[PDB]
Structures are given as structure tokens and as C-alpha cells.
Design a protein around this nucleic acid. Structure first.
Length: 200
RNA sequence: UAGAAGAAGUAAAUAUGUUAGGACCCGAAAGAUGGUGAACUAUACUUGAACGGAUUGAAGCCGAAGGAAACUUUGGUGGAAGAUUCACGCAGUGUUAACGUGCAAAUUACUUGUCAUAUUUGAGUAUAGGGGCGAAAGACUCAUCGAACUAUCUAGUAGCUGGUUCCACCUGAAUAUUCCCUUAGGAAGGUCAAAGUAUUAAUAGUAUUGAUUGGUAAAGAUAAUGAUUAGGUGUCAACAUCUUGUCAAACUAUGAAUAAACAAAGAAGAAUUCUCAGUGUUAAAUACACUUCAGGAAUUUAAAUAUAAACAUACUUUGAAUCGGCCAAGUCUGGUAAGCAGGACUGGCGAUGCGGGAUGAACCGAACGUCGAGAUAAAGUGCCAAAAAGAAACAUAACGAGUACCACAAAAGGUAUUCAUUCAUAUUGACAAUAGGACGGUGGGGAAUGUGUAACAACUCACCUAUCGAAUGAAUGAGUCCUGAAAAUGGAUGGCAUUAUAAUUUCUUAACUGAUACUCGACCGUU
RNA sequence: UGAAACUGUCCUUAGUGCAGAUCUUGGUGGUAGUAGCAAAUACUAAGAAGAGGAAAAAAACAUCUUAGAACUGAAGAGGAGA
RNA sequence: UAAUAACCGCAACAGGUCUCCAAGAAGCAAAAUCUUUAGUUAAAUAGAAUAACGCAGGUAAGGGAAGUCGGCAACAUAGCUC
RNA sequence: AAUCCGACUGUUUAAUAAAAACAUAGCAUUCUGAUAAAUCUAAAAGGUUCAUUACAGAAUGUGAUUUCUGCCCAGUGCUCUGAAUGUCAAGGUAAUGAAAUUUACUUAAGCGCGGGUUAACGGCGGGAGUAUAUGACUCUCUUAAGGUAGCCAAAUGCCUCGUCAUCUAAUUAGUGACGCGCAUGAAUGGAUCACCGUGAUUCCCACUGUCCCUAUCUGCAAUCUAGUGAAACCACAGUCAA
RNA sequence: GGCGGCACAUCUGUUACAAGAUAACGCAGGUGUCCAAAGAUGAACUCAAUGAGGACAGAAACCUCAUGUAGAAUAUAAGGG
RNA sequence: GGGGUGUCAGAAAAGUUACCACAGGGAUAACUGGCUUGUGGCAGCCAAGCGCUCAUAGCGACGUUGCUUUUUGAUCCUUCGAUGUCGGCUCUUCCUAUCCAUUUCAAGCAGAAUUGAAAAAAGGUAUGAUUGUUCACCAUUUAAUAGGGAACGUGAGCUGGGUUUAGACCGUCGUGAGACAGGUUAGUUUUACCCUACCGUUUCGGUAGAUUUUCAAAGUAUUUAGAUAGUAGCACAACUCAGUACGAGAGGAACCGUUGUGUCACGCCACUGGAUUAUUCAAUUAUUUGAUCAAAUAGUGUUGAGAAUCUAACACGUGUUGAAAUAAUGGCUGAAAGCCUCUCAAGCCAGAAUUUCGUCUAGAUGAAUACUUUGUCUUUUUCUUGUUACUUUAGUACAAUUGAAAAU
RNA sequence: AGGUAGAUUACCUGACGUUCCCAUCUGUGUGAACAUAAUGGUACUGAUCAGGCUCUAAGCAUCUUUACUUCCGUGUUCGGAUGGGAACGGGUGUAUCCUACUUGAUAUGAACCUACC
RNA sequence: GACCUUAAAGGUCACCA
């Protein structure tokens, strides 16, 4: 017994996180947010696509979990386990409230109980991002379009011109990598700064 | 902290406000006091009246038969019973019949019950209102009873409902705050009116310049408190350390916009010079503080952001109504949501008509003495309906489109159509098509794609030549269209109607139409 | 039309202005020549009296007498009392 | 007068109000029904036509409560002798 | 043919309830020796039962007969033939003081203390083991007493249209059983029914316009006419869709 | 309306909108106290925690050094100091 | 200063009324309606899987987007000087989210029986036991025994079973009066004669442009006419097809044709049946005519037969009926796009219980004919039941140039 | 140059090393008395044998930190305003105001009174 | 659901229409 998704779609009220003032919150459905080869070096996957939300709306924890499973099954079948890395970039930090009514009931004197969790997203906010190789980019986009069928509102797919989750475009990263300003970190990069004490 | 400081009060007639009285008029259910009723009904007593026919057959008594006896069997007689029934009457079970402005303020018809001893009934008599009487229903006590009738207190009280009587003119509101046994109501106070003043240190819902205040929006997240996903490095955890992803109304370093409160020359429009006193601080003071920048005299002087303001400004007194509110939103909180509930700021409706939105308390323009002429506003120009012509496109083979608030439509899908972007082949020959080959080891121009033969075989496909001559193929975005698309009386772009529009989007033309608003003119009134 | 009192100005005074109160009292409409004038068996012919049965059937006619036909049915629609 | 007109109910109100006298038939019966003595034929108007819908009284083929809350209403049994 | 209620005859809410309600006989309890009990009255050589005298008077509950009325006196009543030195008034006594005043001691009922009484108001329990299920048996908690004899989805049972039979083709209805019974139960009377009832309920036979499914007959109206002739109601009025 | 609750006198944070004011039976909590010292003053000292040492002694007894912006304590709810 | 008012600017204060009363209230609940749609109902999009293989024959998880007002909620805008509050009975209409009949497409459709979907709302959709029931559950029958709206349709339409006053009983609660979405039983259902609507039925009025006297117009009468409005026929069974098609077998159809039945609608009185105050004919009980005859009375005494008239769900006839165009769908030719394609292109065909003609009923302005008239014309008076012609006093006009290509 | 008293209260702090001390300051010796504690460690008092070892002060560093500038960026947000577009959700255009975090460059103190050198 | 109590379990309320 779960309410229709249209009941809690619009972003209303101040953010209501789970804290010492909000007790009895059910555990969110989604627990894994990074899937695929989470340890792949920054140079293996140059590609990058995003799911960009075009609506200001609440996204429930169930919708994110359904999309996470949908991409996982489709991407494992297509690009294999060690050929993609998808990171979900929205967390269910906002807790919804439900005023259940049992005619022997109070009419309006009651404040709602905890009902679930949702992520208050806005316009132009990246929802899910993933990086892959050239040979898997068409297979990644296909699984990403199917993921958008589980969200509400309107979503747009963007093929970024930058590297795999970094902030430099593809040629800037390649130039900086060859100079030495980029140092691998297993799954990311560290910037070679010219600050701090000199070595011996 | 009242008073005095060269007295102001008093009397009478009005008006207004408070107060008491019937108290602006009409309105309770109630309470008390004194009387009248048992001709209706209730019960009781006295004295009278009224049982006709059937059914059944208790004691008591007699005959016959049997018996030692006790007694029994049988046939009669008798006529008891708060026994069974019919009738004169009476009641009121049913039709929930008739009637229901009736024959009748409780009756009529049939059916039903009952119809003499706890019976029916006449007259007399007794019991009276916090009383009587009750085989008990709060029943009856003159059509009046969970406390009769009648008159006085009494025009009882009402924070509640209804009504409240001539004209013109001028000004013109309220839902905050405090308290109440307060929440349908009052007093203090705010808003408003009328009277009466003061030459008036007594102007500002504004901007600018200058010095500030604050912690909202935003921002941050090994910056403090918390929440949370991973990845490196050092000594599988774990612990440190370096990055990464995402957050906070009851977290914060930083921190706007809008605002709040100052100053921009009133001991009376500045400044300087000279002289200068009383107290006190001070170690003592000529310093310093206050004393009309104590005081007094000379000289100079109207200067010191902008804008507006003399029917300006400051008011004083008396008093009315009012504190049920409602709507809108580039706002917020609870709620799934509401034409829901409650708030911050402002404008409105209430109190408000006029022109437009077909119609509408709030929407848009604009607020109104009586008129004439013109330019206009919102918005419109196929007809209803006053007013337009031209230009280009995406629409339109459909109850598609058509004046915001507003009276609805979503996700998704389409080798439907228009434009644009990206890539590939684009010719010396791409795609579509016609003709041919599409193979040997290998039962291993693709191990040959599919049809196909048990299978090789045959056909056919990718592919390659021949023929044929200008675009072709793929992806993505932005419009429009179609499906998605189902509700109950017959109907709603307002209707008719339009369809290279009379639809939609944008334009061109010193085009046009139109308000009680603007301008000019005349007249009425207020100041 | 009406046939004996009345008006204009200034002050004064007030039982001073009505469309509403289910207002009070009085009068009057539409409804409307409408709904009705239907329990109790029932009247008819000739004549008399009377203004009061006429008439192209105006089909009905109150009282009294006679005749016909009937009802109450003797716990009466009879004869008498409180 | 003593009441379907003299009393009480607003009245010439189908309500109410205490008594006496009491023929024949038939029958168990003062029952229902008819008649004699007495009373009356008028007791809130009639005439025509013979629609619907009614009020009051009835019947009905075949089936027999299937109707309905429910045999409500109506039908059905009915005296006397053995 | 049965079920429920009331034993019966009787009475009752004039004008929506005629009954299972009231009365009743029977049963039971309480007080009173009459100068009393009950009780009217402002008072009274006043009044009623009472012209009476416990087989009587007055106050109550249950409701014929049969069978039977279980346990509880803690709580609230009622009562005692009962205890004094707990608490208790006006008074009375005594002291100080100039006096009012103040202070101390002593006083009745009542309550408290103790007993009786339930046909006085009333009340009458839980939890766990244990012989394919049930649980005679046992343990344990603590009431004044733990609902006894009986009776039951009842005019009393929420769950519930309880479960099993029977009645029917078909049964939320009826009847017979079962009973951890929300919340039955003993003169607040328990169980039982013979006769009786214009009482409530179910089923058979017979009969039928209740019905299949309506037809038709009569009188009085309604219709039209002569005479006569109201009332309720009425802002103005009277075609629809959106 | 009743039952429930006290939003009825009253404090803190938040809703609350960076002056003041400020709603809901909005949210998270609190009061009817406690104290001859827990009032006044003077002086001395520095807290929580961590690391490293020291017989029994260890994860926790007592002692020492170092780091230690309050991460302790301040009667109480929360916020300030 | 203290003793306190906690309702804290501070009275001294227990209940119940179902026997109830008054001033008021939509400032405020119980019913409809209105906004919302949580909940109830229905419908979509993606595709993890099921479906022996196979995501999509048929389903569709994890998610997600809607519609409806047929449940109950949430609010308190209208009604408190009153909108009669459940169900059933009767009757009409409307919606489609369709149960049957008709036409099609799909299947894991061999046949039969089925399942999913489209056009389509013109026609049908039942009888009973229990319950006041809506709902439900059983037993039947049927082609099917679908779901809903109309002030939760419908009380001056009925009923009064339930709910919901006043009597009474039980159980639990309360010391008591009394309470009980606890049970049981008894309980008055008023008025249309007004306006409109609907159904029938009368009265008066009436349509403008022709002048070939073989003409034109008015009055009366008949014969016709048909803008518009309504609409009607459905369904089943039996024979044959045929034990055939199909299928290994088990089983097992359909088209044409023929013949009946049921219902609905319109009629009808011959045959069959029913009512019957022709109080017809006859009989007969009680009373009264002295008896016989002949009657009367008992509001139609009663019984048997009973013509006429009316009527049958009880008798019996007709609605078997024709053309064209269509919807969903299947196709033809054929581009766009050299090929393909039923056409989100032009152009055609077949295809429904569909639509329109044809047919049936009511019907407006009309037309023809017969007779009476008039021949430039009316107004106002006036006779008649009414109409036309007609009568009187006056005024007015007087034969002669208007107005046509069609199609694209 | 040093010391005492300060004002600004990190440009003044913290970590790592470094430089003099000639005066001054500090550290330094002692415990008899004032005074002090468990302890002459602290605080107290008396003193001058030694020392720049610490303190102090001055400077060093691609130093954490802190303080100004630019940039971030006219990007976030915001005051006013439609019969502007959208079914909503939200987001234009016009006249305007305009942050923050981060990053890069720079700085790591200035200044007042008294005495002594 | 609301109030109370115990070491999840009970107990009382859930009414006028």
C-alpha cells in the first residue's frame, strides 16, 4: 500500500531531513549509488553522459532504485562488468510525511507521520552520470534512455565534451596529463600543485 | 507627582454624550400573590334501575349389579362456576378502508372483541393546584396538565430576531493592540466627523551623499555541529592522511536585494573677537563639566544635497460607527488536495457605479455634478457589432485552431509534415531497380544469408560486375499534426459561420472604432 | 364637484412626514361562477290554493286532499316522563 | 320537545344524553328478514348524458401465496342429529 | 403442528402504543399493645385507618400451581437487649483582672469503637503444566464471596448469516441440540406450561384476483346544465438548453 | 458538540519573511522548583580528551611529563555568555 | 510584608431529560448539490520475468502518467420563520467503461467450446427460498440473465418493513434520575380546484404578388399535398445441410432453403372462454295478497342456463419488406520513396441489429376542382350565428421602351 | 639597540630549524629572617659565581593560518512590471541591485609615553 | 484511534444524528 506518485511530486515546504527531531523514518530503498567499475583509472573511460532533470520536482527513493537496477542489468549485459562506471548523484535526504486517516477520527487536528524519502531536484541538475569507452558509448546511451522511463517529469541526455567525471575537456586533459599536472589516484586524478614546502 | 506664583466663576434656556427609570417599538419559556372550578374525567360513599336464549354439567340425592368389608361399576336426578357462547348494549383489534378546508376540533362502514358480580348505569355527596385522584399511561382534574383556569405584580428581563417615516449639499470609515465567566457581547485604543484655536523649535509612506545595524536569499560541506557515496597512501579490518558525490527549519565561516534608525546647521539663521561670573571635578588649576554654547560688548553674516509643502503645519475638546470579513499574488506554513485552514507586504471588494473580458464582488482600463465637441485607455475591426487593408510562414481532409484570470488534460508513441545541426557515400558513376557470378579443399563473394533437398543439389541474400544517371543513407534537436482521449436532459471559440481563413505566430501602413477617464466650452453647487 | 370657514410671513411648541414590523383596525381582489349543495331505499297521477310549469320538452314544480307505491318494523323513525 | 330539528357539542351537526308500555310470521333465540296498530315519504337541490380516475357492493377461465415485510384484503368453514 | 411472554377472569396512555405493561390470588419481609404505628394540619378539649385491637393496623418486594431459592456482613444502609471517658453545642462551675474580655474543668444525642442482618442496596476471579485432541489430575497468584442448581446465539451472544441436524428445489427465517456465556442465572426471582390470549413467531391442509394479467357488472359521484355558492394560497409572474 | 488535549498564566529554538510586530488543536522541548551556599569578595589554579611512562595495577583505581580555543563545568528545558 | 484566587486582572457551584420548553443560528453537525480524489473504480507508458524454446498469443514485477464521481472520506459555500430522511413497487429517459444478438481483426484459433480487441447503445437483459435491507448466498431458466446516472430519479405516486418521539421487556453501565451504531415488541403518512409541463379536446384569426375572360382574386365545400416531428420489429428453436467439413480418435460445425415458437407494437369479435340489472327464461327459501293465476318485498333474495355489448396475459390476423451509401475491417490501381505500400496522397470496390430513400402516424405554409361572385382601390360605420357578394357620400389610376448564355 | 607601561588585538598565532647579548632582560646561587607550600618546584626574600642553553627579541621557508587586491562573475540571488510563453511544474524579456566558496599575486606588523644605551 | 497499567500484553472509552 503506497500512495500515487502524483501526491508527492511537487517540491513543497522546507527541507525535512532525518535528525534528532524526526524519528521513525523508514530506511530508503536505494543503498548503492556507484555501480560498475568503481575503481577504474581516470584514463580508461574518457566518455561521459548525464541525465539532466528539466523539472523542479521530488524524486522518490524508489524511482532512483528502479533506475539503478535498470541500468545495472542493461549495462552488464552489453558492456560487461568492467567496462562502465555509473554514479547516481541524487540522495534521498528529504523525508515525506503522510497523514493517515482511519467517523471516530479527528477531522483536521493532526500532523503527518513519516512516509518515505525523496530527493528535491531542480532544473538543470545532473541526476545520474556514467563513464565508459568509445566502443560502449552507444550501449551506454541506450541503457540511459531506458532509465528515464522510471522517473517523473522530463529528462534530457547530454553527451559531455569533458573527460570521465573531471572538469577539463578531452584535449585539455590530454595535454595536462602529458605535462605532469595530472596524477592518477586509482579512480580519479590529483592536481600537481606548485604550493607547499619543497622536497629534499 | 497636588497647589500658590496681582483671583474666574456663576445662573438660566437649548443641543450632544453618560446614567436611572416601560426608556426607540413589539416579542419569551418562566416566578410570586389572591381567587374560580369534579356540568368533562378519576376515585369513594348514600339511594335507585338493568340479566332474555342456548352449551357444558361440580358437590348433594335415588335405582340396579358386584363385594366379608372397605367400597366399586352402571343409569338417572341436581344445577355450581369471578365456566363457554348469542342478543339489547358497549368498546376500539384490523382494513394502517371512508373522511381528512370532514357528519365529526377523533366521526362513519365492515371485520374483531366483549356483553352481570373486579358487571353497566342515573341523581345526591366527598376530595382542589407542589393539591386532589390514579388496577400506574406522568394518566385525569370542563377541547387547557412533566403542575389547570383566572386576575394583579407586569409595558416582568432579553448580550437574541424583526421594524424604525422629508429633500439637496459636504466630509467619510472598521476586522490591529490590552483586559473581561470573554468567543453572537463590552471598556481602553486605532480609523472618522463636528466644534474651537495657534504665527507656527510646528512638514515628509521620496530619492542622494556619509557613518552604521541585521544574518534572510544565496553559499559551504576535513571551515566548527551534524547527515552521507565511493577512491588513493601509510601503520582485510580498523586508525590516521589526501581527494570525490550529495544535504540541513530547529548547522554555520561568508553574506546580498529589499529594509530599519541617524546626520546634512532652531534656546529659536551662522561665525569670530574681547571681556567674563556661580558651583564642582582637580594635586592646584587660567584645563574641564553644567549653568538661556550663565552673562555682556563689537565685527562679519541668510551659507551649508535634491524634490514637494500657507485652504501648509501643530493641534485641543466632544463624540458616532467598527473590530463575523472576503479576494488577487513572479509569497509562506499544515494537508494528497480543495472555491480547505492559517499568516508577512501591498492593492482591492465590502462601501463601487462606468468601458472591455458573451455572462461574473474582486480580473484589465479607469473611479462618477448636468451637458456639447474632440483626441484616447483596456481591447477590438467577416455578420450579430461601431471599426482594416496589405505581407510571410508553421496549421487546417479534424466538433483542429480561435479574447489572459477561465472554467481542464498527462506520460508515451508515429517511415506524419517543416526547419536546423552532425557524420558517411556524394562520379566519372552512390542509392532504387533489371541481368549474371556469388566459389575449391570444405561433410571446414561470407563454414555461403534465407528459402529449400534426409543432405549435398536448385533458387535466393550480403558481396562483386553489367545496365541505369543525381542526390542518397544515418543520428539528434526545435515547431505543428495524429493516437493517447470514456458519463450520464440537448448545447456551446458567446452564436452564425471560416478553412492559401473570417485560425495561429510575427509584422507594415502619420489606418480605424471607443469609457461617466483626458482636453476645450457652457451651466449648478462646495471651498 | 363641494357650501362655511380659511390662508401667507416671523418667532414658539410638538402626540410632526411611512412601503415593510406573520405590524393594529376597517374595507376589497385573483382563485371563482370554481370545489361543492352525493349516508338515513322513493317517489307518481288527478284536483284545490297561489303571481309563482312556463315550453320549439324549459324532461325537474314547494303546501293540502284523494288514489297508487313504499320505509321505521313494535329493545320503532310509535305513545309518554326525569 | 324529550331528540336523524325544541337538551349539550358555534347549527335543523351521521357525535353524546337516564327511563315506562311492547302484535304476527319463522326460529333455541327480544338474532337477521317481512308485515299489522301508530308514524312518515321529508329529512345539507335537481335534470340530462352513461368518458377517464374514484368510493361502496360483485363475479371470473387455467394455476393456486409464485404477490407481499407479513395470506393485509378477500375467498373458504358455519344450523341440528348420529 | 410447534416456539416466546403473561398463570387465569379483569385494567390501561379520552384524540397515533391494548400489550409481554398494571391488577390479581399465592409467597415473603418490617414496625406497632392502642396515651401505639402510619399520617393530614399554621394551631387546636383538631383529623383519617379506628363503630378498630395482632386471625388487627400500617409500609414494601415478588406475581397461580409444581420443583427450588446457592455462596458473600468487606462497602453503603438498617439495627443492638451493648462499651466508656476518642471526638462533640448552648449551658453550668471556677480563676485573673477595675471591668468587658480571656482561660481552665464538666456536660446529651450524633459519629468513632464492637456485634447482628442480604425474600436490605448489591456482588459472586486470573495464569500455566499434564492421560492423535480434550484435561479428570497438579502447581501458582488473592478475594467479603469467587456465578451454585439450572438455562441459552433466548425479546438476553459483539464476533455472527456461530457449529451440527431438520424443515425447502433453494432458508440472515423457525425448530432440536453444543456452549470459556462481549454482558444468563436463582422472590431485580431460576427452571418448567396444562387450560386461557382482538399478544409476538414459524410451518402444513383448505380456499381464493394477493399474483401470472387483467376483463367485466351495479349504485353514488366526477362530466354538462337551471338555481345557489365558499376556502387554502398569492413580491411580480409563469416555454426550454448551457 | 461530546470524549481526548490546554495552544487559558508562562520560557527556549524553529515556522518567521536579515528593524519592530507577528497565525494555526504548526514542530522539538520546558515552569509552579532548587540554593547559608549553589549569595558577596579576595587569592591560587585550568578543564574534556589524547599520547608516553610507573610493583601488585589489567580496558577502567593512584602518580608524572607533553599536546590540549573549551571539544569540560556552570542546579534545571533550549539558546546565548 | 504574609495568608489567594493555576479559569493565573482573581464567582463560592453536581447530573439527567427518549416528557421537555423559549430566544435565536445555516456564525454550526446529521441529506442532496459544489471544490478535492486520499480511498473506491477504470485506463495507459517502460520492460525483470512467466508463458516447454519465445519480453509483448495471453500476463506483466521494480517504477511511473492519467481519467471518473457509481464507495467512503476532507471542507462547511447554499438551506434551522423546515427542500418530507432508507428500501421496495410503478414508469420514462440518458451514459458506455458491452452481457446477448450484427459486422470484423488476433491466438500457444485443426473442429467444438473459448480468449484478447475494434465499429456499434437502434433492440433485449428473467423467476424464486432467507433478510426491512442496498449488498450477499443459494435453486432454476435463458441468446444474455452487464455495469451506472437523473436532488444517493421517483411519499399532494403507493407502502411504512427499517430507521427516528411518546408505552413495555432483557443484557451491560450508573448510588440515582437515566445511557447504550446493544437486541425485541406496539406506534395518525394531510391539501391540487392555482400557473406551467405532459396527454387529449374546442373556438376565433390567418401568409403577396398572376392578370391569355379558356384569365385573375375572394367566400363556401371536397379531393389532395407533405417543411417538420416520431418511427418497429426483434430473438430463439426444429428439418435439411450432416454424423458431412475438421480430426489419429474422442468428438463435431456453418452459408442458402423450409417450418414454427416467444415477446413487443398495431388491430380485431368469426370460432373458444369470461363478466352479465335484456333483475331475459326457469326454478326456489322467508313474508303478504282468502286459495289458483299473477306478482311484490329481502337496497340485484338466491341458484341453473343465458343472448347483446365489452373483452383475453384465455380467441386470432399483420409487422419475412424493397434500393443506395456507409463505420471498424478486407481489398484494387498507385505514387510519395525507380522497389514496397489499401491512401497521416489523389481515385475506386466489398463490407453492420448502421444511415438515407421507399413504407407507417401527426402535420405548417400550400394546390386543383365545383358553385356564388367581382374585374382600380381601401378606411370608418353597419346587418348576420358568422362570411362573401352587396348599399350610400366622396377621392384616386387610366395601353404601350422593365432585368437571362452556359461551363470552367 | 634594550627595558617598563600600553593602544590595535594573529600582518601579532602555530610547526621547523637559526642570530647576537656590549648595556638591558632572562635564565642563575642561596634559605637567615617577612612569607611559602606535601616539596625553596611555585610564590617570598637575600645575592652576583658562572651562561647566551632556553626565554625574549630579529630574521628563514614555493610552510599551515591570518590580512588587503584581482578574479570568480555581472554567473547565484533580488526590488519593480503584462490580456508575456507553459496543462502543470516552474522558468523569460524590460528598467535595476548584485553576493559567496574557491583560485592567483602580495604582506607576515604599524604605532604612543618614560629611563638607559 | 484515544487514556491507563504491566514486563509486546491487557483494561475502559469509540456517543447525538
Amino acid at each position: 500500500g503506497r500512495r500515487p506518485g502524483r501526491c508527492y511530486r511537487l517540491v513543497r515546504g522546507h527541507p525535512y531531513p532525518k535528525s534528532k527531531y524526526c524519528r521513525g523514518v523508514p530506511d530508503p530503498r536505494i543503498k548503492l549509488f556507484d555501480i560498475g567499475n568503481r575503481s577504474a583509472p581516470c584514463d580508461d573511460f574518457p566518455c561521459c553522459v548525464h541525465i539532466v532533470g528539466l523539472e523542479r520536482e521530488n524524486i522518490s527513493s524508489e524511482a532512483m532504485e528502479a533506475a539503478r537496477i535498470s541500468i545495472n542489468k542493461n549495462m552488464l549485459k552489453y558492456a560487461g562488468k568492467d567496462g562502465f562506471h555509473v554514479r547516481i548523484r541524487i540522495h534521498p535526504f528529504h523525508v515525506l510525511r503522510i497523514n493517515k486517516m482511519l467517523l471516530q477520527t479527528g477531522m483536521r487536528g493532526a500532523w503527518g507521520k513519516s512516509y518515505g524519502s525523496c530527493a528535491r531536484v531542480k532544473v538543470g541538475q545532473v541526476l545520474i552520470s556514467g563513464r565508459c569507452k568509445e566502443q560502449h558509448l552507444p550501449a551506454m546511451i541506450k541503457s540511459f534512455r531506458l532509465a528515464c522511463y522510471k522517473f517523473a517529469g522530463r529528462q534530457k541526455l547530454v553527451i559531455s565534451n569533458k573527460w570521465g567525471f573531471t572538469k577539463y575537456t578531452k584535449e585539455e586533459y590530454q595535454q595536462l596529463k602529458k605535462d605532469g599536472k595530472i596524477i592518477a589516484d586509482g579512480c580519479y586524478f590529483k592536481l600537481a600543485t606548485t604550493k607547499g614546502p619543497l622536497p629534499k
